[PDB]
Amino acid sequence: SHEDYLIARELIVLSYSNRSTLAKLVSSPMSILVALVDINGTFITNEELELEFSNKYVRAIVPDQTFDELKQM
């Protein structure tokens, strides 16, 4: 796809020089992004270890300062 081409040209040209602050860098913001996705439909697990879906909705109560962190990243 096109976005794959963008990613590949943008990593291949920087992975020729940067070899210490690239995978460590771009893989770090993801930990914050997961706190931004509203659940609409869910999978569960029991104590007895069985999936059991749920139509539960849950919002994403993200604070404000982690966005500033994310922007610095």
Binding site: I44, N46, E50, E52
Partner: protein
């Protein structure tokens, strides 16, 4: 598609609270000159009331549309509260450095102080007009300068603004009585709220439309929406008994051995979690939303038939759909019950008015099964109105679970019989299949009590009455999904958190409030359109908007007939107080607004008699008329519906007196030579040639010293006489003192929309959770 519906529902924000920054106005003062009688002009000028935004169309039908649009503006502006200090401004000429409500009012007051040509009394009045307060009562009185109609609208918005005094007791009272009275929940708050506070109440007026009476396509969607909402708040069965060990008990009791884990046809095949949860969710959500559910099972699997007994006992039979439970009851009767007494299989008929359990209740002679089947057949909901809302309630015997004891009695009896017609292996299989339920008895009882408790607890958070009516689309229910639930369950109570309840209640409140408010909108426009004689107006797009603002429908596949029936019902609804008062304030002033607006005229008189012109004073001499009496009149909208220009043509060719009535443009002509030349009589010949009447523009003969030939009047002793007067009123004169009013308001309140956020709530430990009978649920071990 499914998840989208809940995304739409839970994104229903409430009705956004309004608060205006300025005042509704239609009029404004304006300086015109004044021409003293005999025509000549004063050095002094004068203020008059004129209309802001002269935009009135031509023709009467278009004007009634305009006033409907004005009604739409006023409704869209129609606020819920207001604080006048936030719009107040200074007065640059007040003795006491006071204030006034609007910027334009202040502009007027600061423009009249500067003019040479203003009396001293108004300047004193401006020096003495100021704000006033009384803070013990939190009340304020501000000055204002307002046309009477404007004062009427604004005063209505003051006196009829929807707020209610907020306290700490009303917070509790917003919660249902059952939750407050349910000992399994503990409530508190960390704030005391003052008497300075306010809050707005939703409109929770029940269904004025009866959509459960032949609006089945909409009710299917509504019921589906409420079902899927209820699925998002029914708890997940968080804690269970195991699956592999339970299935090993099944496979060590029943000697289908070894490795019946993989071979799956008998007593099995849908034992998993992923259906037990589905049944637990489905039953509660269906009974809450009142949605019928159909059954997809298999007859080879007899445990499904056995757990359908428990299902058809704990759940009413009028709640299912007919053919499915007919098949299931028929199957049960044919292979568990009648073979247990040597009876024939059955001889059932497809289209039979009675279900097999009814016609079986009288045939067999056993006390236990007879009273069990009697209960089943006569199990049904109990309608009851509580807290205003109808509710479908369970029996009060299902709730404190003892139905299961009658069930066990029947099943134990059937164990005690013999099966003469059939071999030993079959009986052995069946009797083991029902011993496997006997051994789960107490857990079944606990399950029944738990379903009843969670059901009533979630029923508490409902605002719209819950009717018992069958539906187009159903919800599948495999009977193995009951068998799973009935076989994977134990010593694990699940109580809905209070926050789920508050969430669900606020969602239903917001949906209901939106529903009633948009109903009131539609009813207002329909009644107003019908009382303004709007006959070319197709009342469809309004209803399309009505259905669009309800964020659950698909307008791409809803027809015109449902819309028109919905309109036919909406015709018959009383308009709410706000809208009704604003409309009866408009029916009594649409003409008085339409008497103004110097771009149209309400008619023209044509009387071929050299009649006199009138000594007005904003004009000088004019060909104006203000009564329309004597001469006979012709309505033009009548003439333009049914084109019959025979009458009018006859009347024009024979120079017969007549009047023409309807919103007509006009053009002022300040040439005296156009008076003696009689050009206003020259306009009506195009009505006989090209029979249209649209480019019809009579003349207004405004005469004054600014006309370049006025000197004749002041040299020759002739009062202006003329022909073909115009039917039109004059502007009203601006009286500064009499136009001033004092607007009252409350001082410094604060409006809180959400009302349960101040409540913090907690649950007792769910092991020690109790039902209506003050006796624990989930206690058998």
């Amino acid at each position: 598609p499914k998840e989208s519906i809940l995304k739409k529902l839970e994104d229903i924000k409430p009705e956004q609270v309004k608060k205006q920054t300025k005042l509704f106005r239609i009029f404004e003062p304006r300086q015109l000159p004044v021409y003293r009688a005999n025509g000549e002009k004063e050095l002094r000028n004068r203020w008059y009331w004129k209309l802001k935004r002269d935009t009135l169309p031509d023709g009467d039908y278009d004007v009634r549309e305009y006033f409907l649009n004005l009604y739409d503006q006023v409704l869209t502006e129609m606020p819920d509260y207001l604080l006048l200090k936030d719009m107040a401004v200074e007065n640059k000429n007040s003795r006491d450095a006071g204030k006034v409500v609007d910027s334009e009012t202040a502009a007027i007051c600061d423009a009249i102080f500067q003019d040479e040509e203003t009396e001293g009394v108004v300047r004193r009045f401006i020096a003495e007009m100021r704000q006033r307060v009384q803070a013990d009562r939190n009340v304020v009185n501000y000055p204002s300068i307002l046309h009477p109609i404007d004062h009427a609208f604004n005063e209505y918005f003051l006196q009829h603004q929807l707020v209610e005094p907020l306290n700490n007791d009303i917070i509790f009272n917003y919660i249902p009585e059952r939750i407050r009275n349910d000992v399994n929940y503990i409530l508190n708050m960390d704030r005391n709220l003052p008497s300075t506070a306010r809050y707005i109440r939703p409109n929770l007026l029940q269904d004025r439309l009866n959509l459960h009476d032949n609006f089945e396509s909409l009710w299917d969607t509504i019921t589906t929406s409420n079902y899927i909402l209820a699925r998002s708040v029914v708890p997940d069965l968080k804690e269970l008994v195991s699956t592999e060990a339970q299935i090993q008990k099944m496979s060590q009791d029943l000697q289908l051995e070894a490795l019946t884990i993989q071979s799956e046809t008998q007593f099995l095949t849908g034992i998993n979690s992923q259906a037990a949860n589905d049944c637990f969710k489905t039953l509660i959500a269906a009974m809450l939303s009142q949605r019928t559910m159909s059954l997809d099972f298999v007859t080879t699997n007899y445990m499904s038939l056995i757990s359908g007994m428990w299902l058809l006992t704990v759940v009413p039979n009028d709640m299912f759909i007919r053919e499915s439970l007919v098949a299931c009851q028929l199957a049960i009767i044919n292979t568990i019950i009648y073979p247990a007494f040597g009876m024939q299989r059955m001889h059932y008929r497809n289209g039979d008015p009675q279900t097999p359990f009814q016609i079986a209740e009288q045939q067999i002679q056993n006390f236990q099964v007879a009273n069990w089947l009697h209960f089943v057949n006569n199990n049904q909901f109990r309608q009851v109105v509580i807290d205003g809302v109808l509710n479908q309630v369970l029996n009060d015997n299902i709730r404190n679970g003892h139905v299961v004891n009658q069930l066990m009695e029947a099943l134990m009896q059937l164990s005690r019989q013999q099966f003469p017609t059939m071999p030993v292996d079959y009986k052995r299989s069946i009797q083991r299949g029902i011993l496997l339920l006997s051994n789960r008895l107490g857990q079944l009882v606990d399950l029944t009590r738990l379903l009843a408790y969670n059901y009533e607890t979630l029923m508490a958070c409902i605002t719209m009455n819950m009717q018992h009516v069958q539906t187009l689309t159903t919800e599948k229910l495999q009977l193995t999904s009951v068998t799973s639930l009935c076989m994977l369950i134990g010593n694990a109570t699940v109580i809905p958190s209070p926050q789920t309840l508050f969430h669900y209640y606020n969602v239903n409140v917001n949906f209901h409030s939106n529903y009633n408010e948009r109903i009131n909108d539609a009813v207002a426009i329909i009644t107003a359109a019908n009382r303004l004689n709007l006959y070319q107006k197709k009342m469809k797009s309004i209803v399309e908007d009505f259905l669009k603002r309800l964020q659950i429908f698909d307008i791409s596949r809803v027809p015109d007939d449902q819309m028109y029936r919905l309109r036919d019902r909406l015709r018959l609804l009383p308009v709410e107080i706000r809208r009704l008062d604003i409309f009866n304030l408009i029916l009594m002033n649409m003409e008085q607004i339409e008497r103004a607006s110097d771009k149209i005229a309400q008619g023209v008189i044509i009387a071929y008699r050299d009649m006199q012109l009138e000594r007005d004073e904003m004009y000088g001499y004019v060909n104006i008329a203000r009564n329309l009496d004597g001469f006979q009149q012709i309505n033009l909208e009548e003439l333009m519906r049914t084109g019959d220009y025979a009458q009018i043509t006859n009347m024009l060719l024979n120079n017969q007196p007549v009047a023409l009535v309807g919103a007509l443009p006009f053009i002022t002509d300040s040439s005296v030579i156009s008076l003696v030349a009689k050009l206003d009589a020259t306009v009506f010949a195009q009505i006989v040639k090209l029979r249209k009447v649209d480019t019809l523009k009579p003349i207004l003969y405004k005469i004054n010293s600014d006309s370049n030939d006025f000197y004749l009047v002041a040299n020759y002793d002739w009062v202006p006489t003329s022909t073909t007067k115009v039917y039109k009123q004059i502007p009203q004169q601006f009286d500064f003192r009499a136009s001033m009013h004092m607007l009252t308001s409350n001082l410094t309140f604060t409006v809180y929309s959400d009302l349960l956020a101040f409540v913090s709530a907690d649950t007792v430990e769910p092991i020690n959770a109790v039902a209506f009978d003050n006796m624990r649920i989930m206690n058998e071990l």
